Amino acid sequence: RDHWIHVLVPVGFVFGYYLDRKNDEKLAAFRNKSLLYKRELKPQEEVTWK
Amino acid sequence: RHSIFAFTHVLIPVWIIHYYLKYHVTTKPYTIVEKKPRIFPGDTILETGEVIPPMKEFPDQH
C-alpha cells in the first residue's frame, strides 16, 4: 500500500476508543448499584452495560 | 411555458404549506390559535343547532 501516511489518524482514533472502552471497565465500582437506576439482571445476560 | 409561473411558484407552495400545517402544526396544541367568531342575535350554530334567542324590541325614537 502506497497510502500508509493517510491511515495514521483513523488508527489513532481506533486505538483511543479501544483505550476508552478498556477504561470504563476499571470504573465498575457501582455497576447495577445506584439507588435510581437499579434493576434486576435479565436472563441470557451477564452485565447491564459493557 | 405560459402557465409555468402560476403552477410552480403558487400551487406547490400551497400543497407543501397545507401538508405542513394540516399534519404537523395542527397536531401540536395551541399553535394555530384562532379567535372565535362573533355571535349576534338571530344566528344559529351549525355544530349544535341551538338558536340564540331574539333580542328585546328597541325602544325606538326615530
Binding site: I5, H6, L8, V9, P10, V11, G12, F13, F15, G16, Y17, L19, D20, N23, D24, L27 | -
Partner: protein
Amino acid sequence: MLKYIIPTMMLMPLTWLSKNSMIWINTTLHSLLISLTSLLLLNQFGDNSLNFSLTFFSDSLSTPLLILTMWLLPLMLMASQHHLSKENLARKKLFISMLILLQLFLIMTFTATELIFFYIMFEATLVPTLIIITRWGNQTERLNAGLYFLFYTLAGSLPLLVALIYIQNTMGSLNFLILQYWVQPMPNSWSNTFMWLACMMAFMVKMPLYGLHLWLPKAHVEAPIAGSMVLAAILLKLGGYGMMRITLLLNPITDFMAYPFIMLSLWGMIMTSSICLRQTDLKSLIAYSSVSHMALVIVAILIQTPWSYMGATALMIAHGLTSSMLFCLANSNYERVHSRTMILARGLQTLLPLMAAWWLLASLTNLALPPSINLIGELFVVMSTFSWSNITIILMGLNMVITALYSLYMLITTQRGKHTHHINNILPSFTRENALMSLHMLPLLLLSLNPKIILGPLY
C-alpha cells in the same frame, strides 16, 4: 478524552513524516477528520455531565469551546500557508507542530477535571503562542510583544497557583466533580479578600480587564495570522472557563466585592469602543473591539445570573468566530497592500466584490445583527445587567451606539469611496482565501438556527 488526544499526538508524526509538498494537504485533511470526530462530545444530559474518566470530563459548557478549537486549527493552517512558502521546510514543520501542540494543550485545558491540571496546561499553552509571536512575526515590536504578553499573565497566576494549592490543603481535593458538593461559604475577612483577588486576577488579566489590557493590542498588530486567530478567538476564552469553574468556590464574597471590577469593565468597554472610533490600524481596531467584548463577558459572569451565563457563553463563541474572520479580512488586506493603514487602501468594492460582501457580513455580525448568536448573547447579557441594576442600561446604551459607529466605519473607509490611484497590485480573489472566509462565516450563520448547543451548562 483519549479518542481526540491520541489523534493529535498521532498526527504529530504525520506532520513530521510528510513529504516536502504535501504537508498542508495531509494536515488539513486529517485535522478536518478530527473536527468531524469531535461532534461525538454532544452526548449531553440535562442533569449529568459526560464524565469520561477520573481526570477528564466535559459538560455542556466546554464542548462548544472544544469544537471551536479543533475546527479552528484547519482555518489557522489555511490562513498561515501563504507567507510560509519561502520559509524552510524544517521550520514549516516546526510551525505546524507548534500549532498542533497548542491545540493539544487547549483541548487538555478545557476537559481537565482537577483545577491543578487545568492550571498546569492552561499555562503550558503559554510557550507555543510566545514562540509563534516572537519568531514568526513581521516587525521589531514582536520582541516587546513577547514581554507584555508573558509577564502580565504569569504575574496574575503565580499568586493563583498558591491559592489553588491552599484549597488542596483546605478542602482536600481540587476535583470539580467533588467541589460541587463540598463547597463551603466564604466569610467576610481580609484573608478571603486576598484569596478572591488571587483566584480572580489571573483570568482578569487573561480576558483582559481594562487597565490590564495593554498586552492585547501590542501582541496583535504584528503576529502571524495563525497566532492572531488563536489569540483572539480561543485563547481569550481561558478566562471565561476560569470564571465558570472558579466562581463556585468564591461565594458569597463575590457579590459585595466585584463592584470596582464591574465599574472598570463597563467604563473601560466604553473607553475602548471610543478608541475604536479613532484608530488607524485594522489589527488594533479589531483588538480593541475584542477588549470591549471581553469586558462585557467579564460583567456577564461577574453578575452571575443564569441568563448572564447563557449570554456570556454565546457571546464568547460568537465573538471568537467574528474576531477570527475579521483578522482574516485584515490579513487579506495586508497581504494585498503590504501595510496596516486603514486610510491607505480605500474603495476596494470597485475592485474586489466578494471581499466586499465578506466585509459587509463581518460588519453586520460584529454589531450584533439579529438573529445571529452574537445578538442572542449580547441581548441576554443586556437583560441580565438590567436585572443587576437599572442605570447600567445607560452605560450599555451609548456603547451599543458606538459599537455600531466604528463597525461600519471600519468597513466604509476600507471599502467605499474613490479607490487609491497609486495602488495597482490588487489581485482578484484567491479560492483559498474565500474558502477560508466562507468556512468562518457559514457556521456563524448556521448556529442561529439551533442555538441550544452553545447556551452554556445550564440551558
